[PDB]
Structure formats: C-alpha cells, structure tokens
Amino acid sequence: HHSKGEELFTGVVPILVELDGDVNGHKFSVSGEGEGDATYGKLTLKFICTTGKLPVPWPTLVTTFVQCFSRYPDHMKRHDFFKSAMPEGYVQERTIFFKDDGNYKTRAEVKFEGDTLVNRIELKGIDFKDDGNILGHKLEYNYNEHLVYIMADKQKNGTKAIFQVHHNIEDGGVQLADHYQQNTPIGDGPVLLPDNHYLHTQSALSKDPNEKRDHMVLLEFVTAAGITHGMDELYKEFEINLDYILGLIFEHNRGEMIEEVKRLIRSSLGNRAKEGLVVDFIQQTNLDDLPDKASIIDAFFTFAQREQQREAEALIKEENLNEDAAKRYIRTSLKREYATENGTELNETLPKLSPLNPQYKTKKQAVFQKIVSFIEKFKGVGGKI
Amino acid sequence: HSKGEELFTGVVPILVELDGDVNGHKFSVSGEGEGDATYGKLTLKFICTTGKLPVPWPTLVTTFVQCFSRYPDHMKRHDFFKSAMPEGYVQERTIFFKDDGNYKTRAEVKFEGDTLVNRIELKGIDFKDDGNILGHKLEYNYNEHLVYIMADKQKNGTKAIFQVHHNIEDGGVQLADHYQQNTPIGDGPVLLPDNHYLHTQSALSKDPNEKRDHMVLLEFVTAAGITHG
Known about the structure:
Two copies of one chain form a homodimer.
Chain A: E1 12-23, E2 26-37, E3 42-49, H1 81-84, E4 90-98, E5 103-113, E6 116-126, E7 146-153, E8 158-168, E9 174-185, E10 197-206, E11 215-225, H2 237-251, H3 256-267, H4 275-283, H5 293-318, H6 323-336, H7 363-378
Parallel strand pairs in A: 1-6
Antiparallel strand pairs in A: 1-2, 2-3, 3-11, 4-5, 4-9, 5-6, 7-8, 7-10, 8-9, 10-11
Helix pairs in contact in A: 2-3, 2-5, 3-4, 5-7
Keywords (chain B): Chromophore, Luminescence, Photoprotein
Subunit structure (chain B): Monomer.
Family (chain B): Belongs to the GFP family.
C-alpha cells in the first residue's frame, strides 16, 4: 500500500451524494446513492431531484455528482491523491464554463461519514441564457468518454485538473463544458502528490422505469493512465503492469514469491491469464543469479517466448492444422493482439480430419476457440513462432 | 466497406509539405516517413527548411493524416478518412490558443502516385510576442488526447472538436481548442460515421545527426467509442 487511505477502498463502499443548487435563481435539490468498487473503477449511483423538476439537464451535473473511486493500476498507485486524503477527505471546487452560456461554480466536501463516502455539494450557476442549451433542455440524455488531466498543486498540497466535456446537443452539434478543478485536503496528514497523469472515464445514463420522480441512473468506469510520456510503442496497460510485477520479483529477496505473484496478478486486471506462465518462471529459474530489474524482465520474456512456441506447436498438432497457414494466422493474431474469424486466414488452417471429435461445435469453432485462448495468454510476450 | 480501405493494408509512404505565416513570421516545413493503418502507427521527421521555426514544434503536431487510424473491425463502417481515397479530403481547422492567437489551416490529404501527401497552408494572427507560442515557452513533449468525430451530412463529410493540452515549460498548461472540417475532394461515395473518437498517442524527439531545426514524431491513432456490431 502507498497510503492508509488506499485500504478503505479495497472492497465495495456505499456512497451518498447531496447537492443543493441555484441556477439563474432556480433553486433545486438532489439526493443520490449507490456504491463504488475501486478495484474495478466502478460506480453505480442513482440521483433524484427531491424538489420536483430539475431546471438544468441531468448530464450537465454528472461531473459534479467521487474520483477516490478511480482504478489506479498497481504501477501508478503512488499517484492516487484522492484516496490518500481519506478518510478526512478533500475539498473539490470547480468552475465549469459552458461555451456561449453560463458557468457553474461548485464547492464540495468528499469524505467518509462513517463507513459511507459522502459528496456534499453547493452549486451556484449564473449568466445562463433562457433559450440556451442548459436552461432550454436541449442536451441529449447520454454521455461521452473524457480524459481528466491531473497535475499536482504543491502550494494548496493537492491537485489541479483541466478537461473539456462534450454534451451532445439534441438534433446535432456539441455543447462544450470546460472544467477547471481544484482538490485540497481537509486534514493535515501526509498525502500523495502525483506526477502528471490522466483519468479515463466512461459514463452511461439510464432511467429506472419504476421511478415516478425526476432522476438519473448513472453507471461509470474510471481508469488512471498517462503517467509516462515519450513512448516508443503504444501504451498497453497490462504490458506495463506485467513489467512492474516482475519488478517486485527482483526486489523480493529472499515459495512466498509464488503467493505474491498469484496475489498481485489476481487483484490486478488484464494479466489474469498469465498467472501460470509467471508462476512457472519463478519455480524454474534461480532468481539469485539474475542481477537487476531489467535482467529478470529479459529472463521472463525469453522463457515466455519458449512456452509460446511450445504451445503453438502443441495446438497445431492437437487439431492437425496445416502448419504454414496456422503459423501465419497465429503470428498475425499475436501482432494484432486478437484472432479473427474474418477473412480466409482461419479457414486455411483447417484440415479435413482431426484427432479429436469436436462433439458439440464445428471444426472451425473448435480451432478458433482454442486460438483465442492462446492469444489471450501470450498477447504481448513478443518473439517468433 | 470502402475501396479506399484497400490502399491502407500495408506500409504507405508519406510526404508532408507546409507553408506557414504566424504574425507575419513565415516558415516552411518538409516532412516524410510512413504510416501503417494496420497498427495505427506513423513515423515522421519534419525539417524547417527556412531556418528557425518561429512557433514551437508541438503546436504543429496536429497540423502535420488520420486516414492512418487503426479502425477496429466492427468500426470500419465509420472510417470516412480512408473512404475518401485516393482522391482524398480537404481538412480545415481553427486552433484557438487560450489567451493568445489562433492558427487557421487548410490542407489537402490525398494520394500522389503511391504516396499519401498532406499539403498545408497555415496562417496565425493575434499572437502575443511574449506569449507561450512566439516566446517558445512550451515543453518539447506531448499528451494523449481523444479526437471527437461527428458526421456532417450537409457537407458530405465530418467534423471534429477536441482540446490539446500543451504543457508550459516550468508550470501549467496552454490549451489549444481545435475545430475541424473534413470534406471529400472527389464526387464518389464516402462513409459517414456515427459519433466515435480517436485515441491519439504521440512522442516527440530529435535526430542526433540533424543539424537543422526539426522534429521526429512517433504516433499511434486508434478509433474507439463504439463496442457492438
């Protein structure tokens, strides 16, 4: 763990959201509840407008209605400010400029009140136009994905963020919402000050069909990334996580290695299918020989690559694939990181007979299904086949 | 889905020519390299042929070929960029630098023989002399961004709106809001997309043997935002 606050989010945590708002004098209240699971960057929240009709559209309020619930992958966990401020919490303030229209100004405390995470918000909006997209209710009931760019702010001992939301307008076009954001600790305890990075967020809006009131059901996933710049290759979160995990293998000096690989691989996402591969690697190499962090990485990819060839050679015989076609198809799939039933590359692998009757599926299906499984396991390993 | 798609199955060489005028400061830039739409990968080297580049290099990255985007199979229906090929498209932008001037750009993106060519006239006005642009205050670096694409039915093409964050050296951010239009040069049928975006990752560097003012760009562009058939 990087902070004591991090431990409070290892499981499912209940959430309350309370918002009082005022937009061009139209007052309103909103109550919200549900939960979040930071291991999966997941949020489920339901919001009711307790005062009747909401005078602004629901989507414009999503951002304002708990980033302590982002999924920081293991290799970046030292940059999770939001969790490190818990339980005392943090103050989150924002101005939100709707282009060609008014702005919201929001102040919130986000903190544990008991074993619940509470977000209490004051919202003042001004200078909105009556025929505008906000007060005129012209925004689609939907939501785009965004990158939330986060920078440290040493002076306030917390963070800044800047990002631009796209609210799709009904009948076409986009209404932009530039967010400026400040997050300051409530307490005086040690916090984690991040390097520049971002949060990748996805959100989906729905209606509860048994809810007579004005409301929004929200489902949202948030993953942190973008901690590294100047990359020679496409970001692949799971490749970076796997390197990191192997990192922990050099620095665990001196049977308990096999329980920590298992443990970290299992609460991480994306490399679950590589557990057996890494565990084999530990049980089959004198790790005291390999000197540093870069050399155990090279030792595992050389070994993962031998296993890659063995398992390709093995599947090819088990299903009696035409060798050349299979090796082309498999190579392409490894480079592209998925296998496709499209084209004719798959069909070219398929023989007239095979050793095993697929009982319940076609030949194509059986061969496809065994290869997708192989690709999942070895995506990223590299090497020749 | 489109006949233009067939032209992008392999490595395609690229030429980039730009003429630039920012606050009366003129400049030319030549660029070359390749694009593999299979991996969404671009490799490009840019040289200022006129001497010193009078704006920072990062500010020109977006201006310097989204037809090389990796569209996943279930999204190829939405790849306008390739569908307009080989006759190609016009790509127009305004890029608004916050608390500073704007660039306006007009470019033809098209095949010439076996080569994908991007030809750009760029004009910039109202820049501050000790602004982040003319004062060369921007980091030599780049952040990932999403590029939000929308159809434009009337102009038989697409629009895009997105915001680039240029890190100011020694603290803060200079934003750059991009408004973009893409229209086919040809009369042929093209593909009109449902809303989606392009995730764009860029790395900037220097060739150690080039003496001229220059930029090496390694970039990956992947389409996303739709998850069904």
